[PDB]
Amino acid sequence: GGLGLIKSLAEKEKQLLERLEAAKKEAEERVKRAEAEAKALLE
Amino acid sequence: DDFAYLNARVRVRRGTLLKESFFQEALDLSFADFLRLLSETVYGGELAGQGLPDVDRAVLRTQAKLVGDLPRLVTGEAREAVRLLLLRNDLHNLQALLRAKATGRPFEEVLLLPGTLREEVWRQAYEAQDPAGMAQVLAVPGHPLARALRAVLRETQDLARVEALLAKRFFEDVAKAAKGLDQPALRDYLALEVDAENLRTAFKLQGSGLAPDAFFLKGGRFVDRVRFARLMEGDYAVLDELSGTPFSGLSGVRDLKALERGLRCVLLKEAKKGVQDPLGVGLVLAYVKEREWEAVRLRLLARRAYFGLPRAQVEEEVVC
Amino acid sequence: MAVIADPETAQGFRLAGLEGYGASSAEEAQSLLETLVERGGYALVAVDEALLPDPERAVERLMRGRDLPVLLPIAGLKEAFQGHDVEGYMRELVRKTIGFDIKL
Amino acid sequence: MIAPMEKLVLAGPKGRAKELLQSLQQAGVVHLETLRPEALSAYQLSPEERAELRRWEAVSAGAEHTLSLLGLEAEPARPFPEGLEAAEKALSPIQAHAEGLTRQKQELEEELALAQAYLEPLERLAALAHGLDKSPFLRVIPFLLTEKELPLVEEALRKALEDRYLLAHEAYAGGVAALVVVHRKEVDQAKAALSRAGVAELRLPGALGELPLSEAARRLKERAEAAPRELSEVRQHLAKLARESASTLQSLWTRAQDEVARLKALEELASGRFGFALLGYVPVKAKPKVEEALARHKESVVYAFEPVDEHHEADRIPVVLDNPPWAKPFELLVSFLNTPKYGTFDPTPVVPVFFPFWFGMIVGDIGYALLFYLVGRWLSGYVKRNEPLVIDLFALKLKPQVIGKLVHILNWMVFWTVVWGVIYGEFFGTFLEHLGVFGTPEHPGLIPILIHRIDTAKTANLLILLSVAFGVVLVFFGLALRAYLGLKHRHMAHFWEGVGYLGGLVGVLALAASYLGNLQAGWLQGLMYLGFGVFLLAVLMSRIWLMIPEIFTQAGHILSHIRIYAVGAAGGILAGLLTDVGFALAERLGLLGVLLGLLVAGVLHLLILLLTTLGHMLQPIRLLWVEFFTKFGFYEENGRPYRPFKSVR
């Protein structure tokens, strides 16, 4: 099915948007790790 | 084709007309009395609410309902004749379309009043690369504007001088088609309109100093090109030279307001001669011009009631 | 330039080649006034008397400096049967201006 | 017959979509589809893509205007792969030189026209202006007017300065250059009075009606002496630029039209959120070419070629002919009509099967057949010349493919035409009067005529029966096609209607040949009763009230086939009358003006051929389109044709 191929494209775009959302979210998780390390180092 | 089956509905619509006392009593109102009298009128059947713009929109809808059908319900030589009656709104829509294409505003900029062809054609004509392609998109078979704009289109791409020369060729081809019909009175009425428009261009261009032969048109019978140049110059004697023609009372006038008022008066008087022809098509043209005089009277009384005009302020509007 | 009176009034100005607006209520008149003030339009604004009598308010609140969009309390046509009572406007003007109303 | 025309989709990434779109436009063998509705984006490309597309479209428009001002026409060719700004730079210099040359040509042409319009008049008026050129006391009222009605303005001159106002008209007899001179202000008043009497000042445009008359005459003479060599050099440099840059402009216009078509095709995409899909239809015969195009996708991002729909509901299906090589040329006449409903009966084969047969039955002049053969030889030489046929007052511009299809159709017509003309036995009309090639018992000279056709006492009923049999057979074939198509679409209304109309026609022919025909109505009385019963039974099973009006209209359509035999007999009788008159007036009237009489008769025969044979051929295809299509319908919703990606080349 062609719109079932659109559905396979929906699984793939969930993978793409997953890489997007995990990247731009995991970056702020590393922001958390960085501020933890540096604030403890300052203290 | 049948100039009588349409003439029966024309006589029925002629039965649906307001008298002169409907406006004479309307000389004193307060737009609520006028709203009630219009609510009695058939044109108030599309009466939406209160206000001048609602009144004008209802008048336009009533004009489309009672006058727009005359372009339909006919086929043949009678259709080719009756198409060239409600043609000023179509040429105005085409002129606004050319002005919008040359200007650059939105395609929904002008309000695009009702004419003869489909408005979807006018919407589709907003996007066209060639002017001849836009003419072919606007090409109806018996549309005189389609033949006029195509013949005038062999000058440039899109010019304002092209638009003015297209209006000149539009009046010229209208006169050519009016000569090219088997109608004893429609040719005379169209020629009277052509000579009046020549006089109107002369009075609007009096003192401009431009070339009158480039401004003067061909198709009239009441005036001369030398008379046209004399009207182009500051000589009201040429307007006094109009004796015996339908331009009788148009004499001793220099102000264009009362001049075109009397011109419209002479045109409506010539249109009153259309009741003599109950078998041709000029009776329907008389009905259309009667609805036009009613429409001018309606928007006039509407402005008078909405702005509180004096009776003397519009006394020169209902003399005929 | 720009004016605000009424759509029926403003279409004459747009026919002049002059930017028009039109508001039925006085608050919407200050709304359109505020609109053309924020969208600083060539420095002139005329306002009808019937909507705003003394339309200095939006420019003295917003464009306190530079004096640029010149305001005019213009007369409206349904009221221009009367003719604004120009003398009374002038008396009101000098009384607003130097405080001291007298007779000319 | 129409092909399978399967549907197909694919998807990938967006840049992958642009690359695959460029390939599938290079392999432009598939019509597209919208597929807007579900689970996908609108695939609005980019504002940057919109700007580049507007730039390329303006480039194509500028190339079109450059060819127009050059006068050349847009001929497709192999494109020029170049950058957009680079192609713009290549366009801009030639377009600038062309625009400047065109404006200079228009200006110099109008200037030479206005100079030649008043050259000698300005010179004679300047020779008359040897005593007031710019004298600050008296104006110079010039009027290049009509013939010597000089007293009509001399009345106003008598109203002017009476023993003064030097006013005469010297020369240049195309217009009497009435020059008057009195003063400044009184002369202005007198010019007003003379214009009231009818007068005009020599007001030229530019500077000639704006500078002093001696200086205007010098400038006009200078422009008149200079304009011819300038116009010749302008035309020469314009033609040189055209012959130097037309191929580059054409390749640029081809590449620009290709890129613009690719951009417009990019508007029809179906995005998948940083990824994109596309779908459409294409025939089954190019599925190998479709796969060969599909290999160029990045990992061949998967294209699926799914099957087309059934007899129900295939309206966005593309349409194509797909005829045989024998049947390929017949499609051009069928192209004047619309397209089918994707499962309808392609009647294109019966067109070449019967139209040439009825055409050969129509015209039986072997000399006119050889004239058509020589005309086809001339057209074939034009085709071998590989030039598009251009007919100016006929406005007939033709590529060689349509002309070759016409020539093949003409040869296929002429074969059966010569066959039936040998059957009628007529060489350039009745040459058997002069050289008795046809054989009758009245005067046997040579081989006998199968159809004598000069005598109708033995041949007319046979010819009418032949026409009626061919017409009833075609009517049976058309009603059978209607019923078979109603069975194929499984809509019993159309099939039962075709069955009832066929039964009514059969019973009508049976009752006609029984009552109005011969005797012995026993073998066909039950036949007519069965036809009437079939008509009534299908009327009950149909209930459409498609009345005896419909049956009588079908009957008239069947009976109209005798017009073929009618027009054939008419043309034959006319040709025989003209040939007998020519042979008599040549040989029997003297036997000496055989050249003059034969030439006049052949010229009249050529005039009659030019007046008759066009409509004579037209009546067969008119009968074909009016019968074979109309019994089978062929007037339902017109179909949607195969509009693949163009790649105009």
From Swiss-Prot, chain B:
Source taxon at top rank: Bacteria
Entry protein name: V-type ATP synthase subunit C
Chain coiled-coil ranges: none
What GO terms describe the biological role, i.e. biological process, of this protein?
proton motive force-driven plasma membrane ATP synthesis
The protein's job, in short, is:
Produces ATP from ADP in the presence of a proton gradient across the membrane.
Q: Which UniProt keywords apply?
A: ATP synthesis, Hydrogen ion transport, Ion transport, Transport
Family the UniProt entry places it in:
Belongs to the V-ATPase V0D/AC39 subunit family.
Database matches in HAMAP family: ATP_synth_C_arch
The Gene Ontology terms for molecular function here are:
ATP binding; proton-transporting ATP synthase activity, rotational mechanism; proton-transporting ATPase activity, rotational mechanism
Would the keyword Ion transport be found if you checked this record's keyword annotation? yes
Native species: Thermus thermophilus (strain ATCC 27634 / DSM 579 / HB8)
**Gene name, Swiss-Prot/TrEMBL:** atpC
Gene Ontology cellular component?
Answer: proton-transporting V-type ATPase, V0 domain
Q: Enumerate the SUPFAM superfamilies for this protein.
A: V-type ATP synthase subunit C
Swiss-Prot record, chain C:
Q: Kindly provide the name given to this protein in its UniProt entry.
A: V-type ATP synthase subunit F
Q: What does this protein do?
A: Produces ATP from ADP in the presence of a proton gradient across the membrane.
Family per similarity comment: Belongs to the V-ATPase F subunit family.
Keywords linked to the UniProt accession: ATP synthesis, Hydrogen ion transport, Ion transport, Transport
Q: Which Pfam families match?
A: ATP-synt_F
| GO MF entries | ATP binding; proton-transporting ATP synthase activity, rotational mechanism; proton-transporting ATPase activity, rotational mechanism
Lineage: superkingdom: Bacteria
